Structures are given as C-alpha cells and as structure tokens.
Design a protein around this ligand. Structure first.
Ligand SMILES: Nc1ncnc2c1ncn2[C@@H]1O[C@H](COP(=O)(O)O)[C@@H](O)[C@H]1O
Ligand SMILES: [Mg+2]
Lengths: 218, 407
C-alpha cells in the first residue's frame, strides 16, 4: 500500500526536483477505484524521503462473492501501485528534470521500500527479479496471525532496495516489475492498462535474464 | 428439465435446470447417505437497514417487520457464530436401520447445510452423537416423547473448526496486510506532520489513516473472537435451537419459547458440551419491551456475540394467506466488519451500503423454509425416500441461485 524513496546526498531536497513534487506541498491524485497520496515524511539537506500512499475504496472496487467485498486489495502493493506511480511520477519516469538535468542523467545513491507485495513464488522470485538490475535486496515476511501460528505464514513480503541507479530507472523497474507478482491483475483492471504497463520494458527488459518469466506472467 | 414441487405452505415452487445440476454435483460427490437426509436448513434474511447514526443493522427494523404484519410477540435468540449442524440421534443401530433404512451400522449423524458429514472422522461424529444420546437418556426424553429418534437443528462452535481455510486465505490475510501498512501509514504521516493533481492537508490525512487503522484493529479482534484451537471433542460447543421431529410428529406447531425450554431441559443439563441459548421474549407493540430487547442486544454484541435471530413467537406464521419470515437476522456493529469489511463503518462507506435489496433474499428463505418443512412432514408420515429427497434436494438447488452474500 506504501512506496517510499529515500535520498541522502546533500542537498537531499534535490529529490523533490527530480520527482517534480514540492516537499512542502502534499498532494492527492485520482485513480480508478480510489486515490493516491504523495507527501514527504522527511525533507532536509541531509535526508529526503518521499511516500506514495494508496487510498483504495473497498466499495467502488467491488462495484467495478464474499471476497469481492472483503479482500486485501486496499492494503497491498498490487498493480494499483504501478498505476499510481505513473500518475504521480510520470515526468521523472521519462527522465526529464530541467532544474537538475545533471542529477537526472547519472546514478544516484537511492533506497526504496515496497510494503506488502503479495508473492506466490516467495522470496526467490523477488531476488530473481531485482538482483540482476543491480540492487541490494532485503526481504521480510509475515505470519498470518501471531495469535494463531498454526495458520502459518502469509504470502506478503516487504521489500527493500538499495543501489546506485538513475531515478528514472528506479521508477521504471518498480513500475514494470510490481505487476509481475500480481497474479490477479487481469481481474481488477484487464487488458487496457495491462498492455500500457508492459510497453515500458522496451529496453532493459529485453536484456533481463528473467525475460521469459516476466513475459509469461503478463 | 424444469422441476415443480408442491408443499403445504406454498403449493408451487420451481426448481430450474441450472440449479438442479449445481445441486446434483455436491449431492452425489460429497453428501452423506441420503437415508439420513430428511431435512436441510434454509438460508435466512436480514432486516431493512437502520437509519440510526453509524448503524447498518438494528433491532428496531426487525421488530417492525413483525409488528406491521400482525405478529405481536417475537423471540430473540443469540445468533451463535459457528456452522449449522443437523443432528439426528437414534437409540441404537437397529432403530436407524428400521426407521431410516440406513445400512452402515451407525446410530446417528451430524451433517451440514449442504448435507455433508460435519466431521471428516466418523469416530468423532459417533462420539458426539453418543454424548447427546446420554443426555437424552438421563432427562427421560425418549419416554416423554414416545420416540426412539430425534432430529435437532443446531449450531456447532467454534467457527474456526470448519472455516480454517477461509481464515487462512482470506480473513487473516486482510488482517495482517491491513494492520501492517495502516500502522506504517500512520507513522509516516505523523513524521510528516511534525516536519511540516490537487493539494492535500497532512493533518487530515493523518486523522483519516488513524481511523482506518483503528477499524482494521477492531476487524481483527472481531474475527478472532470466533476462533480457538480444537484438540478434542471437549473444545466444541453444540447449541440446538429447534427440535424438528420425533416419531410421528414434526414440532413446527410449537412456539419458540417451547423449543428453547424443552431443549434446555432435555439436552443441556450436566454436560457443558451442549449449551442452552440465551433468549428473550419481546412484545413488539410495547415501548418498554422493545427497549429491553434493544438493551439485551446491545449487551450481547458488546461482549462479542454476533447478534440475534429474531423469530415470530409461533414457529410458522401467516399474515392472512401470506407466509412470513420464520426468522430475521440482526447482527452486531462490530461483527459486521467480517461481512461488509473492516472499514464499512466509515461515513463515506456506510452511507453507500444502506440501499440494499432484501427482496430476493426473503423470497429464497420462504421457498427453502417451505421445502424443509415439507421434507420433514413427508418423512414423519412415512412417504417413500424419493418424495422426502426431492424437497431436500430442492433446498440445495435454490441455494445455488446467485444473491448478495453479505445478507
Ligand atoms: N438461535 C439461532 N437460530 C437460528 N439460526 C442460528 C441461531 N444461532 C446461529 N444461527 C445460524 O445463523 C445462520 C443465519 O445467518 P448467519 O449470518 O450465519 C443460520 O443458518 C444458523 O446456522
Ligand atoms: Mg454463521
């Protein structure tokens, strides 16, 4: 439900120009079946962190079986997170930054956190997808209910990425790779938008060692 | 082809082709011996939505359903949160063979609303049946009812005993994902708040997500209340609410106070496995009595009860020639987060949920109720199996008709 991006090269507030969002001005964007919020929990010379928050309406979602009404969709980083990234960070994804063109053209020290990514294939799939792009990848998992350990573990993983990468590459990688894990995407949107967010791979994807796996899941 | 069934309460009930085939599937692949299947319980309707602030269901509307249709008194019973279980007990295996035609040597059965054995393990079933046999033995039930068999309508707790796959794959999945991201959301906004498309206000966002978080927490507490580990038969609880049938008699002519009283006396003494049902009588014409009903429902649900089943004083009731609901469900505010969603109580959500249509659900219940009554009367008057079976099969078929699952 949450994506954060953290930058620590002084002046770290440069993250604001690169993402085309003023750290002092929180914003809300409209999505299909809800909203996305962007704001900066921290913004100093030493450390800047941006947050992208999904605000999914459970009623409008269902109107678009019992588990059509009660489900994990409002709380996970599904393809909705990709759709939101494109809606909020579209210019940064393209590589444009007229205020800091030099920073946008080079590798920057960056950290990203993606919460509650549902993944049927486990940790293994996540490493196979992100490691070959050069990230240092941290994964943590969760039990379904700590009062009922017998129910076993969830299929949710919170993923940490760290590396030296261009802003546009970090955004593109997450934009394209998140839906690879979303086994129920063709259910919640179907065809129109799914095609839109596969066209974006037109480069590194053809060279990704998991091209088959990625093209398959689509 | 199409199937027309005739019942005493409704002379024409149609079973369509689609429904008959969907029923045939589950009936032939997983169901118990059809010689035991003398009844299937009906689906149940909820009330009109409430107006009262931040409430979806409330006692007043269920009370009004009956009062405006000429029924002066209702019995409110705690809605146990488990799985419906039909419990048939014979005195011995010779009674089952003679009366029922059952050949596998069993002397009883506990089955579900779809007609499957409740327990995967027969020994556990036989064990449960035997505990019920002994209580009936000591209360003098067989003699007082001149019968060597009985068919009880019950709830079997805990819910988690049958719903574990649902809890694992759906309910606890929403709960862990929900609690984790919502807490992290609150924490980030709080940090943003302290360090302070369209413009948003950080403090409003923080307030909103703080509320989403508190609701998610209460949703998790709500589902947990109906779960606990089962390591033996002693972790279970059986709560019978209808005595349906004994030799020569379908007890649909007895009022619900009678059912509650007779069950408490013959079934629940000196065996904590078999519990009585908390209930009250309400005069729906009287303001004071209605106030008690409300208070009693508020206390029950505040202490974690699902809600109540509101029943007409008499078992079967009519407004002129019009058959009325034999039961209306009225569920707690907190319980309903498991049905309508953890966040259904938030203003922008709960208002969109007030416009629900129970017409279809009400019609399915009457038809299923009428088939079940007919199955029981055909069996009690000794008609051949296929005449009993077609009504029971009919209930199964109607249950495959699509309808809002939150009702
Ligand atoms: N006292 C009661 N009388 C009738 N049904 C009950 C009672 N307590 C629990 N139930 C269950 O409640 C169901 C009605 O809908 P719920 O929302 O599960 C029935 O199918 C029963 O299994
Ligand atoms: Mg129930």
């Amino acid at each position: 439900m949450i994506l954060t991006i953290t930058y620590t090269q002084p002046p770290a507030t440069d993250l604001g120009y690169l993402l085309h969002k003023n750290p002092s001005r929180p914003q809300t964007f409209e999505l299909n079946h809800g909203k996305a919020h962007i704001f900066y929990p921290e913004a100093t010379s030493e450390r800047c962190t941006v947050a992208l928050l999904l605000d999914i309406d459970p009623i409008d979602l269902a109107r678009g079986g019992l588990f059509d009404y009660v489900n994990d969709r409002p709380y996970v980083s599904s393809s909705f997170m990709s759709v939101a990234i494109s809606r909020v960070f579209g210019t940064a994804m393209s590589g444009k930054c007229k205020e800091k063109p030099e920073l946008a053209a080079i590798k920057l020290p960056l950290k990203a956190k993606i919460m509650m990514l549902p993944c049927k294939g486990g940790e293994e799939i996540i490493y196979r997808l992100f490691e070959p792009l050069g990230y240092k990848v941290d994964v943590e998992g969760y039990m379904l209910d700590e009062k009922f350990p017998e129910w076993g573990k969830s299929r949710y993983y919170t993923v940490s990425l760290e590396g030296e990468v261009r802003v546009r590459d970090l955004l593109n990688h997450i934009y394209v790779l998140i839906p690879v894990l979303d086994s129920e995407k063709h259910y919640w949107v179907g065809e129109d938008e799914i095609d839109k967010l596969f066209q974006h791979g037109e480069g590194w994807l053809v060279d990704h060692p998991e091209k088959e796996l990625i093209t398959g899941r689509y | 082809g199409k199937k027309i069934i005739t019942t005493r309460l409704m002379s024409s009930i149609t079973i369509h082709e689609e429904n008959s085939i969907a029923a045939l599937e589950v009936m032939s692949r997983f169901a118990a011996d059809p010689h035991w299947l003398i009844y299937l319980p009906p689906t149940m309707s909820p009330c009109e939505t409430s107006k009262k602030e931040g409430m979806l269901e409330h006692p007043i509307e269920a009370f009004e359903y009956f009062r405006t249709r000429g029924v002066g008194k209702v019995v409110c019973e705690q809605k146990h949160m488990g799985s419906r279980a039909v419990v048939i007990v014979c005195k011995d295996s010779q009674v089952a063979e003679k009366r029922f035609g059952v050949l596998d040597g069993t002397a009883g059965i506990c089955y579900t609303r779809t007609g499957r054995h409740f327990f995967d393990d027969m020994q556990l079933e036989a064990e449960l049946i035997d505990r019920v046999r002994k209580v009936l033995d000591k209360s003098g039930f067989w003699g007082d009812f001149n019968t060597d068999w009985v068919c009880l309508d019950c709830e079997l707790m805990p819910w988690s005993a049958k719903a574990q796959k649902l809890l694992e794959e759906q309910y606890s999945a929403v709960g862990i994902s929900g609690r984790v991201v919502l807490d992290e959301a609150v924490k980030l906004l709080k940090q943003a708040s302290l360090n302070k498309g369209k413009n948003a206000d950080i403090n409003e966002l923080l307030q909103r997500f703080t509320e989403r978080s508190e609701m998610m927490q209460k949703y998790v507490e709500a589902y947990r209340k109906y779960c606990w580990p089962v390591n033996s038969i002693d972790d279970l609880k059986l709560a019978p609410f209808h005595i349906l049938a004994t030799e020569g008699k379908v007890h649909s002519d007895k009022n619900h106070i009678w059912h509650m009283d007779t069950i408490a006396k013959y079934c629940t003494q000196d065996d904590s496995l078999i519990m009585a049902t908390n209930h009250i009588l309400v005069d729906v014409t009287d303001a004071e009595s209605v106030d008690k009903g409300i208070k009693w429902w508020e206390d029950l649900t505040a202490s974690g009860g699902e809600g109540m089943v509101v029943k007409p004083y008499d078992f079967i009731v009519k407004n002129g020639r019009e058959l009325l609901q034999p039961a209306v469900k009225c569920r707690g505010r907190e319980y309903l987060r498991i049905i309508y969603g953890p966040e259904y109580t938030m203003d922008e959500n709960i208002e969109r949920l007030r416009n629900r249509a129970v017409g279809k659900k009400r019609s399915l219940a009457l038809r299923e109720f009428s088939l079940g009554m007919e199955a029981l009367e055909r069996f009690v008057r000794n008609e051949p199996l296929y005449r009993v079976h077609e009504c029971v099969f009919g209930v199964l078929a109607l249950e495959s008709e699509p309808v809002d699952p939150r009702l």
